[PDB]
Symmetry: C2
Subunit: 281 residues, 2 copies
């Protein structure tokens, strides 16, 4: 029943893999979104594991218990894609179910476009549309100044404060689950605790984590190119996608099934059971 | 006199700074191209140092004596740009002469666009332009090729001795003296599997998109157009790097740049080293 954790070496760093279920069972590979962690999948993972699946959810670099990258420029969608590809390499050589949430869904789309034989079904939860289109020089200046900044996390009195922060951000989290999440990504410091994920990732837009290595044009190509059965899952009260954004996705991924669940952006929390059932279908 | 090396820590890695001349003298910062090393600037650096300049040539990560990046995806133009920005932050706070060759010239243009107040003169030796790209969809194929490559573990050839490695350098750049070819190979070889291999990172020889920033030909020209610092475009009169249309494009885009043709091919830092030093000295 309980989550297991193991580390896998990659590129001089360590990837923390969270898993639930029997190691001999068919794999559901789940990719979390920005600032989250593999444990965020727990409410989806438990009913899947109960039905005979092995659920595997890596912490992306800089998140959860995975290594922070010592050189800031190593944080890129390309690095996360290589990380996920390495995780797949470590899993059994059978087509698996691939699920991604938000940034995780963008990553999953790229992985499914590159490794179609490995992907039995693709489930894209709250897929974002890339930014549409100022000068590259001014972009580059902002980026280089950001990379040299040395962002720090605030000091909370205790883990309970951190858990309350997570519940403010995702009101459907139980007190228990908010604490289980917060304790895994806090560390003692300066007489209290602070987040233990890499502070540099909090301005993901400037780091380019909102886009794939080839930019928007690579992303739109990918969406239409996906060869594997796919379901687009959205929260019926999410504000991630405007109506025109939903239409852009529907008109690009014309072969994808589309499902709306009861919840906002954070459907892995808001509608965990419904999402697990969807994956089981 | 002789080259000195000083190491600077950055991002958990080590940057080797090759330098010639007195530490208190005005700086000429030189950026080498792909597969080369800071020592490749020596023939330019000696006459500059003799005229009272401090010449500094960093080894780019994965090259020369700088660290290899243990995660392959770390090799990007942005990483090299951040590395060069870090090196500038380490140098005195006085506008300096920035010189780049080939890929190093591309990197030099980007850093000059970002930190113009730091640059007295920008000297661009054999500046490339990105090719006009096809509008055919190849981005899935490109990412596949890239991911497969990133997980490959290419091995360098094993040469029987350093003299053989030096011969390979001299075949690549015929104007290299036997002596200088040997000095370069000496620095970038190491024992392996019964002979010697290159000591730079084998993954760099490639498909990784290392040669250019994100944007394409059009975006890059906009960068070039924006350059406010005094600039000299330097070309080899027998170089085939730039077609006449590419030379024309650079001239049209950078209307305030001075332009000069030196006697030699692409590898002017070797072919025309004294002439290039002379040009730098007159800026």
């Amino acid at each position: 029943n309980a989550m297991e954790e193991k580390f896998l070496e990659f590129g001089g760093n360590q990837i923390c893999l969270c898993s639930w279920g029997s190691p001999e069972h068919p794999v559901v590979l789940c990719i979390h979104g920005i600032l989250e962690q593999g444990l965020a999948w727990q409410e989806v993972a438990l009913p899947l594991a109960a039905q005979g699946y092995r659920v595997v959810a890596p912490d992306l670099f800089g998140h959860g218990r995975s290594s922070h990258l010592e050189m800031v420029t190593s944080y890129s969608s390309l690095t996360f894609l290589a990380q996920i590809d390495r995780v797949i390499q470590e899993l059994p050589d059978q087509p698996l179910l691939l699920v991604g949430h938000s940034m995780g869904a963008m990553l999953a789309t790229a992985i499914a476009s590159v490794r179609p034989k490995k992907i039995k079904e693709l489930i894209l939860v709250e897929l974002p549309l890339p930014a549409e289109e100022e000068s590259a020089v001014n972009q580059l200046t902002t980026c280089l100044d950001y990379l040299s900044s040395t962002p720090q996390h605030p000091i909370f009195p205790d883990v309970a404060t951190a858990a309350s922060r997570l519940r403010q951000a995702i009101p459907s989290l139980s007190e228990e689950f908010s604490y289980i999440l917060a304790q895994r990504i806090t560390q003692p410091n300066q007489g209290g605790v602070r987040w233990s994920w890499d502070a540099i990732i909090r301005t993901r837009s400037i780091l380019g984590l909102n886009n794939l290595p080839g930019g928007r044009s690579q992303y739109l190509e990918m969406l239409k190119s996906i060869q594997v059965p796919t379901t687009l899952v959205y929260g019926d009260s999410s504000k991630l996608n405007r109506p025109e954004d939903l239409q852009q996705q529907k008109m690009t991924m014309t072969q994808a099934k589309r499902v709306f669940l009861s919840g906002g952006h954070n459907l892995h929390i808001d509608a965990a059971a419904a999402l697990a059932s969807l994956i089981l279908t």
